[PDB]
Amino acid sequence: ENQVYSPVTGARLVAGCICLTPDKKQVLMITSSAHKKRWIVPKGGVEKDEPNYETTAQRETWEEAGCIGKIVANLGTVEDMRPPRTEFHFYELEIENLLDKFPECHKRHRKLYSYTEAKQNLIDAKRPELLEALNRSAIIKD
Numbered sequence: 001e002n003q004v005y006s007p008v009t010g011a012r013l014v015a016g017c018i019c020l021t022p023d024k025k026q027v028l029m030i031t032s033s034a035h036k037k038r039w040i041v042p043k044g045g046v047e048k049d050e051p052n053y054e055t056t057a058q059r060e061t062w063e064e065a066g067c068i069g070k071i072v073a074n075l076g077t078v079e080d081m082r083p084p085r086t087e088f089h090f091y092e093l094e095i096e097n098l099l100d101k102f103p104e105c106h107k108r109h110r111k112l113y114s115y116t117e118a119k120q121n122l123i124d125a126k127r128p129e130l131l132e133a134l135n136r137s138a139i140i141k142d
């Protein structure tokens with residue numbers, strides 16, 4: 001298979017982006033494939049040939065959200081509390097372009113959100129680890 005695991009905890013290694021607008025007032029969220037009313041952020045499994053997390057992160061942001069930007073920060077890691085099953089590596093991305101067409105554009109909705117709506121969405125989705133990643137970002141909370 002094409003899936004990499006932590007040799008310590010055996011958690012699944014995943015990378016994603018907090019995609020922020022230049023003014024940093026909004027963050028890009030996508031609907032989940034499993035729970036279609038739930039809003040999350042682009043992320044996905046690292047595969048064996050990928051040389052770094054940034055690669056996985058930018059791949060998944062393209063694939064899942066049709067977003068292209070530059071990585072402006074490493075937001076560190078966050079684990080899963082449901083040992084852990086998933087170790088996430090997050091980066092902040094400045095959005096340079098949102099393309100109307102992208103691999104998953106038929107199986108996923110996508111929208112910008114202020115800090116406040118995004119926080120509620122992630123509590124509604126029950127993803128505190130993703131909210132922690134969002135809180136480490138330079139998003140404006142006002």
Ligand SMILES: Nc1ncnc2c1ncn2[C@@H]1O[C@H](COP(=O)(O)OP(=O)(O)OP(=O)(O)OP(=O)(O)OP(=O)(O)O)[C@@H](O)[C@H]1O
Nearest residue numbers: 031032033034035040043044045046080082085086126127
């Ligand atoms: N708190 C949590 N921590 C870790 N994993 C959690 C989770 N809650 C659900 N999942 C589990 O992660 C997978 C993706 O669900 P998701 O986060 O809603 O993502 P998604 O369904 O939008 O994306 P998928 O197409 O399922 O892809 P994955 O994120 O599994 O990874 P992949 O892109 O490399 O296939 C599912 O099997 C789900 O049960």
Ligand SMILES: Nc1ncnc2[nH]cnc12
Nearest residue numbers: 074075076077078135136
């Ligand atoms: N990058 C980070 N990782 C873990 N805890 C943090 N608290 C603030 N920034 C953090």
Ligand SMILES: [Ca+2]
Nearest residue numbers: 043044045064
């Ligand atoms: Ca995914």
